[PDB]
Structure formats: structure tokens, C-alpha cells
């Protein structure tokens with residue numbers, strides 16, 4: 742398992758957590774020196790548990806699919822909560838089985854559906870360590886509309902930060918003040934699958950992407966990524982979604 746405590750948290754301890762999260766994801770191969778997530782894992786080994794504690798020391802445990810870093814569900818006290826999707830229903834066969842009851846959330850875990858449930862795009866939702874503290878607190882007691890917003894914060898401050906060093910850094914910058922994600926952050930989130938695929942396709946193509954990936958950069962400028970020499974590949978991305986899952 743991995744853990745993170747908001748009480749006394751700072752950019753360093755958050756960085757240690759994101760490092761722990763990355764290191765808990767199994768891989769047998771690196772592609773251009775980036776860990777390649779496994780095609781599949783059978784049984785309970787498929788799910789990583791993240792123990793997150795809010796400032797007051799209350800806790801949820803979040804179940805993460807180690808093949809794609811997707812959040813499947815979470816446990817809050819004696820109630821488990823899972824997304825309304827087959828991958829999460831499958832996960833519910835393995836994690837949080839001792840929960841006294843199981844609630845299936847009234848949406849799947851994908852950004853589009855969460856944003857609709859939340860009533861706002863995540864362009865407009867501040868993220869940061871304070872926002873994560875709020876998210877944990879919200880998820881402690883069931884409220885599906887509020888939970889959608891909390892889950893958008895949670896996904897971005899855990900999974901997306903694990904996937905991209907830039908996003909980790911953005912959260913570290915928001916250690917004591919929330920701020921809506923940069924357009925570059927949004928872009929990277931949306932492009933993780935595409936980037937993962939193209940980095941893998943570059944292996945037998947002299948490091949060249951078969952199809953360019955369009956990103957928005959730090960300055961808000963839309964740019965094309967065409968090969969593995971780009972800083973996004975060398976610097977930024979920390980985990981690759983296996984093409985067998987794309």
C-alpha cells in the first residue's frame with residue numbers, strides 16, 4: 742500500500758507520496774526509459790490501496806488499478822464506493838469486501854461523466870493540497886454530486902501527478918493555495934493514452950511518433966510532439982499505458 746497525510750504536508754512529503762505511488766505500480770519493461778505498465782494483472786494484485794488522511798486524521802482508502810492508474814473506488818469508514826463501470830464492479834470482487842455496505846456511485850470514473858455529475862468542467866475546479874484535504878473530507882460522507890467534484894480533485898492530485906512530473910510540480914506549487922489546473926495540465930491528462938501509445942509506436946520507428954500529439958505548453962501555446970526527443974517524453978511522462986489497453 743501507499744499512504745499520504747495532509748496533516749503537516751508540504752511539497753516534499755507530497756513528492757515522497759507521488760514517488761511511492763509510482764514505485765508501487767509494477768512493470769517489467771521500460772520504453773525510452775519510462776516504466777511500461779503491465780498489459781494485465783490477475784486477481785487482487787491488480788489493485789493498489791492508497792491510504793489518504795485529511796488534516797484532522799480521518800481517512801479513506803482508494804483502490805487504484807495498477808495497469809492504468811484508474812481509481813476504481815474507495816472505502817470510507819464501513820462503506821465502500823465504486824464507479825458505475827465494469828472495471829470497478831470487477832474490482833469490488835477483490836477490495837473492501839469487509840465493508841458493511843457497498844454503494845455504486847451514479848456515474849463512471851471518466852472525466853466527462855464526473856464533470857457532468859459535478860456540474861462543472863475541471864478547468865474551473867481548483868486543485869492543490871488544500872483541495873485534496875477537502876476531497877477526502879467530502880468522500881467521508883456520501884453525497885454523489887459533491888463526490889464527483891472531490892473525485893476530479895482526487896484523480897488529478899494522485900493518478901495524474903504520478904503520470905506526469907509537470908502535474909506533480911503543479912500540485913507542489915499549490916501546497917497551501919488551490920488554483921485551477923493550467924491548460925497544459927488539462928492537455929497532458931487528456932493526452933496520456935495518446936502519448937503512451939506513440940512512445941511505444943516509436944520503438945520500431947526510429948523514435949518517431951506514427952501520429953503527432955498536440956499539447957498545450959506552459960505558456961498556453963499549442964504545440965506538436967512528433968518524437969521521443971521532446972521534453973514531454975524525456976522529462977515529464979513517468980508511466981506508460983500499455984498499447985494492449987489502448
Ligand SMILES: Nc1ccn([C@@H]2O[C@H](COP(=O)(O)OP(=O)(O)OP(=O)(O)O)[C@@H](O)[C@H]2O)c(=O)n1
Nearest residue numbers: 810811812813824850851852853854896900931
Ligand atoms: N474509473 C476511472 C475512470 C477514469 N479515471 C480517470 O479518467 C481517465 C480515463 O477516462 P477519461 O479520459 O477521464 O474520461 P473522458 O470522459 O474521456 O475524459 P474527457 O472527455 O474529459 O477527455 C484516466 O486517465 C483516469 O485518470 C479514473 O481515475 N478512474
Ligand SMILES: *[C@@H]1O[C@H](CO)[C@@H](O)[C@H](O)[C@H]1NC(C)=O
Nearest residue numbers: 949966967968969970971972
Ligand atoms: C523531433 O522533435 C524535436 C524536438 O521537439 C524537433 O525539434 C524536431 O524537428 C523533431 N525531429 C524529427 C526528425 O521529427
